[PDB]
């Protein structure tokens, strides 16, 4: 027999009008083991193997709030990876699997698995439709806004096939002036609508609830602080260095994945910045710098 | 077969639990272990330390009664280990208490909140209602921590991490129970029941002699001052010997009180002092035990015995 | 068969640290008929014998605040009457009979009695061990500080072997300064720690709930106001009078049994405070004195 | 078997009920009786006299419809009694209501929290939380109370007295309810159903005649005032006799209100009025029927005759 | 510690020798019990705490009986313990 894998998808943030997959795009949880948000701890085997195959999938959404902030958490499979949101709160009831509860209560959710070996998403492939097993999606509609109302949690018995030299399980991302994100060399930690950088400021919202370590490169003219708040408190070393046209800094910051309307990661002050170069690693708080 | 189903839910009041004890015989034995203090951004056992609540039955958080027949003994097994978390409050306090067994006794405590849903064996339901863990035993004999061991890992049954966050900051939430049938193999005399700690400078508390009401992440030091954060909730007997080369004062801070006649004397470099206080394990900002005042501090001694209101010194 | 009694013990006052039978000592609750605080209507009936045997025995928490105060009130009872009181929170379930849940809820805690005659305490005697069938143990821990959480009831069948000229129910206490209350000729309706003098001033804690008549006899030099207060109001007829160095006054007051951080009653602007004599007897509220 | 038994409790939130009649033949009977008004500090029969709920089948508080015809009749029993507390209110205001019956109909009440709970038969439950006391039954006759005796000990079954203290201040709390199988034996003519009380300087009321809707801790007389304090919760009909020197007005306070067409007169040393009110049982601290303004009052007589809202007199 | 400690013990044992053989390890003296307890304390405080004035004894606080009231003696300048446990 398998192993069981109890593991955290989301914190749940209620909403007043409608919101799917909270801030974030239709991309967020594929189901690949070779996605952070959904598989924060089968990441780590997903990538010394090329093939995966699922056996028991269930979602057990478990709340947070007092009964008192009315919501509604949906939690909705599809067997595409490639159709769109849903768009309205009455596009929900159309799918196959879902199910729909109040905030304040608890809800399971079981997803019948099949018997075809997949890839492993290292890439880069155009079709997700046919290497994913699918998406997940999570919508919620009364009310209760700035609220993180419950969590969600999936369990998992997945078997892997033929290994593989391992997958860089870091980040590598770039950001231009008018650009936005764009990964290099995997894994999906940050999506590309998730920073912003103008003519003196950057910041980066991070939401998959981590501890991380940062290497900012970025192409100023003048220094600048970095401050941490928001969703992540620093393990309170972060030393930077300036120099050349360069500015370096090294974090180590705790995550929780709840929305929050400030970055998580904020650098502001300087002057002309052009590019901005990350490396996220997901560490432990022994990796900090001692002053 | 109408492909949706409506369940309903009436989600009542508060909830509460009563318990007896009958007791009978001359073996299940429930006992409080904490009061859970709920809290705004993130914690791990209250405040208390990253090591603290530890399967041996020579502990003094788990097993307050037990560990004086634990030092007459040697091998223990645990049969059958329940919690049984309650709650003290109505459906309108929000928050998340969760807990958690390791099968380490040695590695550290979230730091986040990534790591508290799927240790490998654990329940996290709300601050409001109920909870019920049970944790499944062996088979194997292992050591009662007598004249300690460095790698206690392979002594110990595991941890427990208690892990509560988002509150309903500083209230009593709820209280954590739990349960055993402990049995013991060939027996010892007995077991010092005295600790002796020694601090330096720079460095931390280094126990000897057994058992663990102190542990190495409770006490500091400096050039003048000195404090002890006594998180286990007894009465206690101290004997602070203090290197120094003045005198100073002790006073008993916010988790603990006097029974009010502590006698101390300076004499050579040498300070010595005996206090009985009664701590309660609350979180406070301040040193329970706390000696300032002096000059120079380079060692302090201990030694603590768990002695009732009858044990103080007189004026 | 017997004749049930359900009698007041305490009005169970919650705390936040750490607290046993609240305000008092391991000796309020000597099981004993010789005593008002678990029994304050068998002690009438407990001054004509010398003997006694329990036969039922039964502790019944009754709540009285609304469920938004969180607490644990723990029932415990030893078999000896002279170990100490438990020193920490996990000092509770290492006992032999015992009873803890929350402040909100009703409990129930059944005492096994025995077969032997013992002596109902009229003295003085130094083993209390002997005598007692028990102690009752009463600990609350979480908070709700300052809140009457709810009241514990007793019910009993006691008979009584051979019979005895009735032990004086009026108390008799001495106060000198930087001394204590030492009682004369008993019973205990005052324990030792429940006063205090000053060189001005003077206070009595009263917690046995009850209706009771003071004769105060205070050697000052100047008069002084009686005041009464926190846990009892007056049946106010208090009439008092000067003279010569004694101070005499008579009082007729209905305490609560609650603790208050303010005496009950207390004497205030005198001088010169060196001896207070008192009489306690526990009257009705017929016993007043018109002005 | 594990020597600890957990037990849940789930408190929901506001428990109720639900109370219907059907009616049916040509035999329990529920009333009303109250509407428990939590206080603050200690009260008794919520301000109400200390003698008030007696039972007798001749008392206006306790059998408002059973009273017309217990005039017709000589003895009575009582065969099921049981009072059955409905709480009005969620599990958010704290308290505490307590039912108490005697068996004299003299005592006194508490005037304290020690006499309370070990009366001899007594529910003493929180506010939000139902209560249901049952009162044992007895075999014996005993006289309908009619041309007023004295000791009425041996006459009347017993008192209720209904204490709460430590609020939720004054609101409406709960109610309580009151149920009896009554039976009658050898019939009177009838029973003249008109009090007739008289006041004197620094005396009371003294009833003569029968039945008992005023009683002696209810009404004042001054030298130049007078008043009332209805507490029974009817509509009445007075007949004010007031020996006085002047004349004066009359009104009517905070229990009650007119029918607002009350016909007074002067003439010789009396005064004369007639009123119709209307109470409501509930306290205030106003006489229901006030009358001052006069000078020398030395006597007041009186005729209370609980009728409708059609013997008003008219403009 | 209770002072009348006769209704507490189940008695003493004396052990007298006489007439010797003087100060040789001669013999030693074997106990056996079946003791059984019954319900449970916390815990009693292993410690004892003796106090002697000037003229007087060892009086016992806290329990148990390590050191008995004849034991010890004090002087105006000098102290001295016999431990025989
Ligand atoms: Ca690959
Ligand atoms: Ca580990
Ligand atoms: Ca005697
Ligand atoms: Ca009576």
New interface residues.
Partial sequence: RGIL????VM?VVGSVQMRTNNGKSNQRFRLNPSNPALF??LAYEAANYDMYRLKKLTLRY???????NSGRVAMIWDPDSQDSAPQSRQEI?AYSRSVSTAV??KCSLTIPADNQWRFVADNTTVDRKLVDFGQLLFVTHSGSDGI?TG?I?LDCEVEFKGPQPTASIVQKTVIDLGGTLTSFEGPSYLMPPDAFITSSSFGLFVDV???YLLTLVVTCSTTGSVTVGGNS?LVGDGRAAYGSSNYIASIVF?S??VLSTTPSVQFSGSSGVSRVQMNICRCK?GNTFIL
């Fill in positions: 894998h109890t593991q955290l914190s924060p701890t478990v709340p947070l709030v007092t009964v008192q009831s304040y209560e993180e969590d949690f609830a981590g501890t408190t705790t929780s994945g708080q």
